Amino acid sequence: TVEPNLHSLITSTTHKWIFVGGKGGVGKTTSSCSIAIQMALSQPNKQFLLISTNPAHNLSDAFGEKFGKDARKVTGMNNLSCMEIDPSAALKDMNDMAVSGGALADLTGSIPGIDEALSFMEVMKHIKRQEQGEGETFDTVIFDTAPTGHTLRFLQLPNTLSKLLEKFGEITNDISGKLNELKANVETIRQQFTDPDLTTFVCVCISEFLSLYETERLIQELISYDMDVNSIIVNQLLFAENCKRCQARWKMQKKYLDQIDELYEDFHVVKMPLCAGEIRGLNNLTKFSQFLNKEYNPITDGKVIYELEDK
Amino acid sequence: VEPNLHSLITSTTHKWIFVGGKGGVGKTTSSCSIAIQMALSQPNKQFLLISTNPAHNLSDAFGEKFGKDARKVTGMNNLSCMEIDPSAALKDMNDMGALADLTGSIPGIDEALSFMEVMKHIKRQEQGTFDTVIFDTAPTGHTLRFLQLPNTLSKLLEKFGEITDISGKLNELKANVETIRQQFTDPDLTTFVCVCISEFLSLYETERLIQELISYDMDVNSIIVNQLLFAENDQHNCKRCQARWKMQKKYLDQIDELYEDFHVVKMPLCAGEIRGLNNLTKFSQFLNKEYNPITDGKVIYELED
């Protein structure tokens, strides 16, 4: 049986790109923070970046401090940084450097897809710098992704820019030099994203009907992209074993959990409890994240769902 | 201000109704519910519920397969659903080859094709097929991108003409876009219903969302607060529920203070699954006549399984 934890991922020394995704509100942000904290703590000599590709950023709300387009350390951590790109501010910067014409952000700052484009550019930057230096980079990038739908668009982007760039070069009739470096860079991203030792996708879900089918669709689609996926976090579990609501909802949860357990026997299925307190701030996030490394035991570790800070 | 959506449900002016909010708060559940209530309340009008969330859940919610072609909800004579598949939609575009498949996966393609659906609808409404369109939107981030398309395209087309049959249709597009821009900014024709839950991570994003919508001159006068435990009314145990309700009620007071002019519609956490027409209909009733925890407390367990 595959162990019900992410210890293997947490202590991995090969993985460079870790996507955390799933349906809306299942716990991507909470889980991506938790994974990032666990990796950073277990690998102090590596530098980690947690980037949000969800345009509605929640990393700042999660940690309770203000992040932005420029990476900043999580306060209290020496090797974990967060990034939340603001498209308009980023395009302003691009306008300035391109000049060194002034209406770029006003024009493109709100085009659908702009968030994925800038997120992807950030991947291209680190891809290049990890090899060529000339600037700051990280050993490992964790992605707190947008819900399913738009994240698939983002993960299709290496293929899409690739297949596209085949044709465009001749149409133009050093502009062609950029194309080659852009093609070469995108190709590199495609190699690494489809390398199971470098890149993996951690799916997050809850034990409810509407999440089950969207989660299965997602995993199937990722596999069709040759994206590695071998880990599933089942979040917000009650473990109610009085109260008519809790026992009724837990009965439901346990029914689908049995189904999840049957289908995904080849996956790390990591079961996380619903906590009474708020999982925010480094302290509470860290305490919650421990159960990604060593599986949660409702009888042994049951009290911790009530031992989260309220400050 | 009455804590329901009755005035929206029985409106005879609203053409475009957006239902949005943070991930997993209950957009799909609420949008299906609103659509049902309007259709039941106005049999004389045809309603379309379009999902602009590229990960569609309307089919999952009703338990039947929807697609790019509008199809009636089984059990409803005047409600239809639409879930556009870009790859499928782009084949028909191309026919009327390799390119269309390329574009099928570009980020923003979902918003584009969804917006075209609005544009096509405008062209039919001006000339001589639904009376009201309800949008089950993607979570906050990408929905703001969609609502900025009228402005975005207008400006795009202004520069496209300057660098430049070809000229003629560019002006037609510019005009159709302006028509959408004015209608979306008309409080009588267009409104945005916000869905949220009484938790910390939801309310900061929700306030961010409403403020941004206001800056777009988009009307927002209704908030659905979903998944409320209410508790106490249960009848007086369960440390989990007791502690979680205390938390919810803390923030519910904050919601009530800030949004005093809004319709604040409080919806209970049901024990059963809100899927299928029957259960969605039973849930949707509390959008019209506000939910009473002391009286209607039984409905929480009455959902069909």
Partner: peptide, 22 residues
């Protein structure tokens, strides 16, 4: 083809950002 124009304009821009970039 009015639908095709709208993709193209959005195609150029989303191609156009990558050309400027550093």
């Amino acid at each position: 083809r009015w639908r095709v124009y709208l993709l193209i304009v959005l195609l150029v821009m989303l191609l156009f950002i990558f050309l400027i970039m550093k």
